[PDB]
């Protein structure tokens, strides 16, 4: 391919490849896969793509784009890197370069959850207008495609529509403004929008690359934090004050929507397992809820600094 578009600011590489297909009139998806990649057995993935390294080679003449830059800034890697650990993070970075989609997903937690959560395409009414006003195009953006939240960080709600990634597994689709929006009222919960605005700065932060505390670091950090809050009995959890605080911070409808509904009667729970010794890396969203319920005076980067220090 003799002319590969540079990704716009804060874009998914899937949209870059789709726009590369648009700019040359390659309607046939097989022809697009042949030209861009060279093999017809690739999967168009949104969030944690593979085969980067032949994408970063098309942009090789542009000095400022390398493999790490696409891995960190134009794929949803910063939402898994701080939590998984060190060796898993390094292995995943090494495997994004090569042609293995399966191994990359296996190394990461919910990437190995083998379910494409809300695989349908999302978009935000107001963001598309701004992008049309400034860039002149409309592209998929990392803010919309949060792992579990169907919500834009700044505006209210993400207006869904039909079609999905898995309907055609070998085709890249690029948004056209002719489907700009449909005017129908939608209101969003305040605390969920607050969570989106709290987790958004983790995407655009250089310090998220090298701050990945280990498992024992996570469990010791949470243990000392719970001791400092004073709700901790001797080697035990109160299991009541924490639930009360998280219920005050986030309502029941929210916990239903993000699929973390509390079961205080059940001994095994997403909140209960954090206090005990950590066995596997928990998702970013559970940690976000814990942080926002316990102490709101520190940002995500400050929390990562405190966790990495000791």
């Amino acid at each position: 391919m003799r002319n590969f578009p540079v990704p716009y600011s804060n874009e998914l590489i899937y949209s870059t490849i789709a726009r590369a297909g648009v700019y040359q009139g390659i309607v046939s998806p097989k022809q697009l896969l042949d030209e861009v990649y060279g093999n017809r057995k690739v999967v168009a993935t949104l969030g944690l793509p593979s085969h980067l390294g032949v994408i970063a080679r098309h942009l090789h003449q542009t000095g400022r784009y390398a493999v790490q830059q696409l891995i960190y800034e134009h794929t949803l890697f910063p939402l898994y890197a701080p939590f998984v650990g060190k060796e898993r993070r390094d292995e995943a970075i090494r495997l994004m370069e090569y042609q293995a989609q399966g191994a990359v997903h296996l190394m990461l937690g919910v990437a190995a959850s083998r379910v494409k959560s809300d695989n349908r395409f999302r978009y935000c009414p107001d963001c598309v207008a701004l992008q049309l006003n400034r860039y002149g195009e409309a592209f998929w953006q990392r803010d919309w495609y949060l792992p579990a939240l169907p919500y834009c960080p700044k505006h209210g709600a993400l207006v869904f529509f039909d079609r999905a990634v898995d309907d055609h597994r070998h085709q890249f689709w690029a948004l056209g403004h002719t489907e700009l929006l449909s005017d129908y009222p939608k209101d969003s919960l305040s605390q969920l929008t607050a969570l989106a605005a709290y987790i958004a700065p983790l995407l655009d932060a250089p310090r998220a690359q090298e701050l990945s505390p280990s498992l024992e670091q996570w469990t010791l950090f949470y243990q000392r934090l719970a001791q400092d809050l004073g709700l901790t009995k001797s080697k035990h959890i109160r299991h009541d004050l924490v639930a009360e605080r998280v219920r005050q911070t986030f309502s029941d409808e929210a916990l239903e929507k993000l699929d973390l509904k509390l079961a205080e009667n059940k001994d095994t729970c997403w909140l209960k397992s954090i206090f005990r010794k950590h066995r596997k890396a928990f998702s970013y969203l559970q940690h976000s809820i814990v942080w926002q319920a316990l102490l709101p005076k520190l940002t995500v980067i400050e929390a990562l600094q405190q966790a990495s220090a000791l």
């Binding site: 003799r2 578009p5 040359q24 009139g25 003449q61 542009t62 195009e137 056209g176």
Partner: protein, 390 residues
């Protein structure tokens, strides 16, 4: 195939040419001093290479037709017009403030729906213009377009984007008025100036005529093509059923809607099929009752390239008159006749050019072009109507 010149941006002095990477990276607009000194060329004529053998002195004298060029009055106007229509065709195609991304987005629908008037944006206009060049055969339509378009770098590479701007492209029409062989010469000339494979993937997939008319004009916008030149547009006279008008409708939809400038070249036999037009004519000896200054300069600059040992520096009025009489104004005939006379003089051994020698060379070695020159000599419109292309 073509050398990729890395771009460096200058400071243009025009308000409209404000921040375009495409037209702020072209070579600076030259002036009247550089409109008549960046085209001139001549043979070296070293005095050390005049005393050599006959074979060396006869092989080094045949390079005159290829290496000699003298800019006339018309070339200044042609250069200025091409400069204007190649610099003004990018202002409506700004890649910075989202204007080229609005011309490429529309062109995907035309590939999909097959109709070349399905706009998706209405705020993306076109700012290209058109030119038409018509002149007698041998006037210099190609060799004075390969030295006026040769001051531009063709393939440029801008690294702020990833775009590889192709400044100008040249193709020529099919031997008949073919339909799928004008949209294939474009690909065959674009992928030998980039080292790519566009013909093997646009056309080999069994496309229709409409899809190959849309894909051509989409890939001509993926690379910011500045000027498209089509040589010998008279080949569309012998077109297929409807080809003589469908392509001339496309050539007015490309400059008006898609926005790529286009320039057309053809012999006066191509005026029947019809665009600002420029008409070229052979040099006339008399302009206002006195010999033409351009003709005098052309002759007196050609006369200073002579490998004959017994050469005459002074050019006789009789010799000039018989040269014009046997040439009838066409520059190709002028240069070719001079070279042939010089070769025959070297062959005989008499190394001074004479009017009789000129006439003998003409009569013996210009047999096919005889009736056209005689028709132009007679100047009767009835005789001119058949052949001589005037």
């Amino acid at each position: 195939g073509a050398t990729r010149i890395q771009a460096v941006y200058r400071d243009t002095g025009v308000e409209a040419y404000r921040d375009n990477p495409f037209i702020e990276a072209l070579p600076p607009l030259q002036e009247s001093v550089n409109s008549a000194a960046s085209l001139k060329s001549s043979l070296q004529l070293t005095s050390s290479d005049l005393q050599k053998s006959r074979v060396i002195r006869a092989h080094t004298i045949c390079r005159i037709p290829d290496d000699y060029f003298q800019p006339l009055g018309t070339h200044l106007l042609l250069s200025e017009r091409i400069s204007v229509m190649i610099r003004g065709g990018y202002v409506g195609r700004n890649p910075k403030t989202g204007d080229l991304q609005k011309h490429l987005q529309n062109g995907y629908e035309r590939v999909q729906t097959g109709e070349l008037e399905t706009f998706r944006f209405e705020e993306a206009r076109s700012t290209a213009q058109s030119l038409l060049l018509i002149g007698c055969s041998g006037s210099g339509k190609t060799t004075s377009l390969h030295r006026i378009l040769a001051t531009y770098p063709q393939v440029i590479y801008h690294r702020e984007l990833n775009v590889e701007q192709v400044v100008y492209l040249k193709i020529d029409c099919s031997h008949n008025g073919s339909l799928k062989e004008i949209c294939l010469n474009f690909f065959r000339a674009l992928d030998r100036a980039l080292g790519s494979n566009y013909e093997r993937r646009y056309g080999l997939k069994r496309h229709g005529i409409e899809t190959m008319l849309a894909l051509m004009s989409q890939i001509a916008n993926a690379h910011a093509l500045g000027l498209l030149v089509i040589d010998e547009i008279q080949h569309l006279s012998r077109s297929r059923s409807g080809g003589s008008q469908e392509m001339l409708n496309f050539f007015v939809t490309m400059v008006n809607i898609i926005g790529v400038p286009v320039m057309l070249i053809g012999t006066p036999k191509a005026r029947e099929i019809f665009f600002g037009a420029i008409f070229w004519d052979p040099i006339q000896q008399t302009q206002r009752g006195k010999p033409n200054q351009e003709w005098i300069a052309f002759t007196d600059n050609l006369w200073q390239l002579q490998l004959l040992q017994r050469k005459d520096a002074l050019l006789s009025d009789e010799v000039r008159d018989v040269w014009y009489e046997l040439s009838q104004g066409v520059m190709d005939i002028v240069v070719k006749l001079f070279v042939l006379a010089q070769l025959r003089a070297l062959a005989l051994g008499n190394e001074r050019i004479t009017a009789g020698l000129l006439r003998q060379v003409y009569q013996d070695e210009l047999k096919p072009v005889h009736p056209m020159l005689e028709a132009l000599r007679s100047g009767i419109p009835e005789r001119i109507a058949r052949y001589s292309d005037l």
